[PDB]
């Protein structure tokens, strides 16, 4: 018997949800199609110091572009990622709506907020503006799906919260599609520092 969690991946169309979940190669090759709901469930295995865990990540087929998702999409989710696009402020402005829809069905499951596409130079939603997670007991990370930057961070934080073990570690990264763009290491260090600085500042 294995440890597995339903993880729903939500956020405006175009924010990079599909690109993100697809980085995990075995999760893509072993994905399962749910015809009633139009969902692809990607089984993403991570090897922890206590054994493998599996995040069954629910990816839409684009229906979020036309309104909210059906209850069945959310039902029995044990955790979630809400994604926005740091080059589109409206996607961040819609984060509260996605959170509302999620909590309506699932209550206060562990949720990570992810700002995607930080590889793009002309960033619009910067650390100082990202505060919704502080307001709602949520963890935040910058991510770049196309470069695999911070790919494992949401999953590690969720694993620790779900399993109740703050010392849980991933023993190795899963096999990921090779980066299609380079995330500048200096830019990443700067963005991480900006997030720390903002975390210490008052709302």
């Amino acid at each position: 018997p294995q440890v597995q969690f339903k993880l729903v991946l939500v956020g405006d169309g175009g924010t990079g949800k599909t690109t993100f979940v697809k980085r995990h190669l075995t999760g893509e090759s072993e994905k399962k199609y749910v015809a009633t709901l139009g969902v692809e469930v990607h089984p993403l295995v991570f090897h922890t110091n206590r054994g493998p865990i599996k995040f069954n990540v629910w990816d839409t087929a684009g229906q979020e572009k036309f309104g909210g998702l059906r209850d069945g999409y959310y039902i029995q989710a044990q955790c979630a990622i809400i994604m926005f696009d740091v080059t589109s402020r409206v996607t961040y402005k819609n984060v509260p709506n996605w959170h509302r829809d999620l909590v309506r069905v699932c209550e206060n499951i562990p949720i990570v907020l992810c700002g995607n596409k930080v590889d793009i130079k002309d960033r619009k939603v910067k650390a100082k503006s990202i505060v919704f997670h502080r307001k709602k007991n949520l963890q935040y990370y910058d991510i770049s799906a196309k470069s695999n930057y911070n790919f494992e961070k949401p999953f590690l934080w969720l694993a620790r919260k779900l399993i109740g073990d703050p010392n849980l570690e991933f023993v190795a990264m899963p096999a990921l599609a090779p980066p299609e763009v380079v995330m500048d290491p200096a830019l990443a260090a700067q963005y991480e520092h900006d997030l720390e600085v903002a975390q210490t500042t008052a709302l």
């Binding site: 294995q2 597995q4 009633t36 709901l37 054994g51 069945g72 029995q76």
Partner: protein
């Protein structure tokens, strides 16, 4: 093997073969995708 140190077995729960949601024994259709219990 594919187990996890400390994990608990719950009786009767069934994994949906379509969407992998773990259902209660009393559920005859998957609460998420409506697939019939195997």
């Amino acid at each position: 093997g594919s187990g996890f140190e400390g994990m608990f077995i719950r009786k009767g729960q069934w994994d949906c073969s379509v969407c992998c949601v773990q259902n209660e024994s009393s559920s005859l259709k998957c609460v998420a995708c409506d697939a019939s219990k195997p």
